[PDB]
Design a protein around this nucleic acid. Structure first.
Lengths: 98, 91, 76, 93, 85, 75, 97, 93
DNA sequence: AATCCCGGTGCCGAGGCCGCTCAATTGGTCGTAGACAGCTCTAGCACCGCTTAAACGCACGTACGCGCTGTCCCCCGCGTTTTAACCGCCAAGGGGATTACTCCCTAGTCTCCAGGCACGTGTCAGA
DNA sequence: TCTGACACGTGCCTGGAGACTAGGGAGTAATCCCCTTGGCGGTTAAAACGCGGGGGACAGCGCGTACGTGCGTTTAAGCGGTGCTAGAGCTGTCTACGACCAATTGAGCGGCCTCGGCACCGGGATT
């Protein structure tokens, strides 16, 4: 774990997120707290997607322990909020909900 | 037996994830379209697949929308006016 | 577009969830598929030509698709 | 060859935190990696738009609080802002 | 028939302007009470609300005429919404 | 939302080009209009709250609409 | 301005450059970039006004002022500019019959 | 009171270029002003996205060529890029 | 007549460990712009009253909506034959990718003036 | 025709512009090898055609009810004129902090290795 990410308790890297923000030239200057906040938001969103995908994999008749792209697609399309954010988004080799 | 193999294909091809368009003729179509801009342009093997999957998604969404319009019209047979209506309402 | 066989259109429609297909749907779906692919390729070639490259890469196609609001996941 | 930077380690750590016995295929790794990249770009573009419209030059936490509230749906955005504020308060002190 | 052409030719604001202000302020209070507005922004929020509803109803008309009818029905509005988001 | 009367919906429909309106259309149109206005105001409120101001200027509403997709010219 | 008239344009090239810098779209902004942006903006404005003028003559009344209704009609009629502006709602505009 | 920055003067000159006696209302002036503003925003945002994708730090004429190619429709894009290149070449000499 | 559960497997394919480096981290300086306080007067909310466009309640006819009937040919769906798509393989080499290097082009500073704009007014479209 | 509305005159002011300096970064040459083209053959799923028939597409008919249209009453919208004041817009200022640089180093990545999780396929349950 990175020193500046562990101090914030997150899992995503604060330093790399800040570097990506600076390299993208989104703004002339970027606050240090902004990188921490973006890392936290990305971590939460990834965690939410992974929780939904895990629940959808558990919902399947087969107790598969590997997250196939179809499982991620089903978890996204079955949700009411993560499926609205990811509308007009095509998951590769994910198919469509039946 | 009209009304048996149709839903067989509906449930067979909606639970699947593999590609549907034949890869070689779609690749030929992509290269023919690109040749109208600059001849001799080279395509990454991944770029053709990334275009094919997006085209599959677009056509699947368009045909599902057209089927919704046809069902709204009280039919089960999609017709060109259904496709035109779906395209007009989408954009 | 004549390489886009009736079988491919039928499979796409069955995945989309239609029951019966008219004999004229194939031509119109071929037309719209050709238009979409033409737009995508004409948009990706701009990215490829800007970067002094003669090879259209998957990142260029993904960016072109994102331009039209058809964001694609898994090719970057 | 230059090293390629991806969120594979981070996404895998998040999965292990969520469920230790789970795993995803390489294609699902790419899907989640592109998901993170797309959300990064979408939130940062809204933050940059906020900076541009109000004639500022710093992209801090507020510019991302408002960006998250703007982009994501309300119920998911509320949790995202709560977690971001929690992490910022943890890091500052 | 007359009113269709009369309203297509016209370009004035169509929704009632004070009830719309009441709706905007009610929604703002529902989000969080105490927020003040601007008299130059309600009109902006209305000319993009009447435009949205007019486009939706034109799409509804296309859907209903496609069905052989001339009268819009809730299923037509639902098809128009489901076809665009 | 009940303030939005039947006459306004009928006039908007006439501008949309219909010839006849069902009796159940009015409630659905009121619901859709309320939802759209709720989203637009929710977003303009976020833009205003960032600015540390408590007024919603036309610029904020225009930006909220622009993010939503329905761009607006003239403000 | 010196550069606006030197480039052969009527739109500013100083305003455009300063706007681009203030937007922070990139850390460095080329001098030719301002000229190119000003040229593109001028051409698009000229095309929009040309369409508005053309569509104002077809009206039943020979109005010599471009009302928002007339410019909206001109935008809606053209395929090319219409596709670009296919989702914008001009303030106090209208819907083509 | 800060001065107001608009394109009214340039829009008026552009209108005078085609038809001298043609005139336009204040609301139409605001319409054209907003059209100019959002077209500038669209093209500049596309150019910035191109710069970010290609990992560069200059939003020059070459980036704006591709931004105009991507944003505008092809038939209008041809004329727009031709005009831009002509103006750039005229300015350079 | 068709559709789902599972045993063995081999067949990968994701996870794990070692060396290494590029980017993260820390300390120090400095300039910058963001937050804060105050002044000011803009406009935003509140209210009263007139005019009346508009909403609304009712009466009444019809004509479009919905269901039913009958046809008929437009498509399922099956078997044959063709054929072209999928995969793996061999090279050729064009071009992507990386690095070293050069210069030119742009950020920043200083000084200057004139292009842009706010108010007022002069003069002309329109209902 | 008066009513309203767009564009000169004029002065004021900030930003556009030119000269100068100083590196940052874009472009280019050199070099290496990666991946794309390509064509071919072997295979086998796929489709193109011909065909029978059956069942939805389409139209006509009929019943009715709900939707439009006209009358008449009522309701509050619009405006617009005024009034009070809450707060936006603008100006100074004083720091907190973000950029930049030099030094240090370890977290992550590429490569090699590893081991078990699982897609599959047929055989036996099921519908």
């Amino acid at each position: 774990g990175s020193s500046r990410s562990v101090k914030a308790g997150l899992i995503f890297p604060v330093g790399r997120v800040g570097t990506l923000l600076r390299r993208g030239q989104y703004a002339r200057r970027i606050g240090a707290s902004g990188a921490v906040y973006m890392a936290a938001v990305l971590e939460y969103l990834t965690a939410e997607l992974l929780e939904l995908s895990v629940k959808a994999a558990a919902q399947q008749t087969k107790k598969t322990k590997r997250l196939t792209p179809r499982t991620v697609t089903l978890a996204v399309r079955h949700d009411d909020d993560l499926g609205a954010l990811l509308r007009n988004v095509t998951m590769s080799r994910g198919g469509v909900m039946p | 037996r009209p009304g048996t193999v149709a839903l067989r294909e509906i449930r067979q091809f909606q639970r699947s994830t593999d590609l549907l368009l034949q890869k070689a003729p779609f690749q030929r179509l992509v290269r023919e379209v690109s040749g109208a801009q600059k001849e001799g342009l080279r395509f990454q093997s991944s770029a053709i697949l990334a275009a094919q999957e997006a085209t599959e998604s677009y056509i699947v969404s368009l045909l599902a929308d057209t089927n919704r319009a046809c069902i709204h019209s009280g039919r089960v047979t999609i017709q060109p006016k259904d496709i035109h209506l779906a395209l007009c309402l989408r954009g | 577009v004549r390489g886009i066989t009736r079988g491919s259109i039928r499979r796409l429609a069955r995945r989309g969830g239609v029951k019966r297909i008219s004999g004229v749907i194939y031509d119109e779906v071929r037309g719209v598929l050709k238009s979409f692919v033409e737009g995508v390729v004409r948009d990706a070639t701009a990215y490829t030509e800007y970067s002094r490259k003669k090879t259209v890469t998957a990142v260029d196609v993904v960016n072109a698709l994102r331009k039209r609001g058809k964001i694609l996941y898994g090719y970057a | 060859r230059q090293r390629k930077r991806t969120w594979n380690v981070y996404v895998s750590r998040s999965l292990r935190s969520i469920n230790s016995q789970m795993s995803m295929t390489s294609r699902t790794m790419k899907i989640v990696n592109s998901f993170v990249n797309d959300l990064f770009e979408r939130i940062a573009a809204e933050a940059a738009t906020i900076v541009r419209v109000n004639r500022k030059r710093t992209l801090g936490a507020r510019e991302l609080q408002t960006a998250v509230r703007l982009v994501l749906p309300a119920d998911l955005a509320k949790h995202a802002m709560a977690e971001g504020t929690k992490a910022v308060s943890h890091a500052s002190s």
